[PDB]
């Protein structure tokens, strides 16, 4: 709305994560991948370190809940999961679990 | 060291800030500005919103401490400060204070 409000929104986004989707929208044009989601973060880590990350999803259940498994290669494989109202949410939850495990948050 | 250790370092950096200087170093070559510091974040915000940010620094004092002021244009100007063992640290502290103020953390 007002741009004191917009200024606060941008500042908060930067303080939280060092990026600002709001500023990006302001600056964006139609003329002319930080990685903010756990799934993206894990894809990047795997690319550098070389392990494979893949997801398996079950169809939406009768309560409209999605469930996914994530596999991150190793011996044995690290397998986690996520649930949620859409598949991408399941993926981010599952990837977050793997990132926390790999971070050795002992 | 070991790359279980390297994997944990990268994962932690991603979880914290959605970037990984460690991964960047691994991937970097000599062949071929998220914004992780408050000073950078504030420079970006000012660029989008249009206000001017500038710093004034005093010379290192007899205890080797630096002190800086930051000015962020408005009426009146927002003026904050930072102290530290080098000028860049002063700048980041001062910029953080301004970001927190602009974020309306009431
Ligand atoms: Cl992905
Ligand atoms: Cl700067």
Curated annotation (Swiss-Prot), chains A, B:
Widely expressed. Expressed in brain, pancreas, heart, skeletal muscles, liver, lung, kidney and placenta. It is found in: Cytoplasm; Rough endoplasmic reticulum. Binds double-stranded RNA (regardless of the sequence) and tubulin. May play a role in specific positioning of mRNAs at given sites in the cell by cross-linking cytoskeletal and RNA components, and in stimulating their translation at the site. Binds tubulin. Binds with low affinity single-stranded RNA or DNA homopolymers. Interacts with CASC3 in an RNA-dependent manner. Identified in a mRNP complex, at least composed of DHX9, DDX3X, ELAVL1, HNRNPU, IGF2BP1, ILF3, PABPC1, PCBP2, PTBP2, STAU1, STAU2, SYNCRIP and YBX1. (Microbial infection) Interacts with HERV-K rec and gag proteins. The gene is STAU1. This is Double-stranded RNA-binding protein Staufen homolog 1. The chain holds residues 448 to 557 of 577 of the full protein. One of the DRDB could be involved in RER binding. The C-terminal contains the tubulin binding domain (TBD).
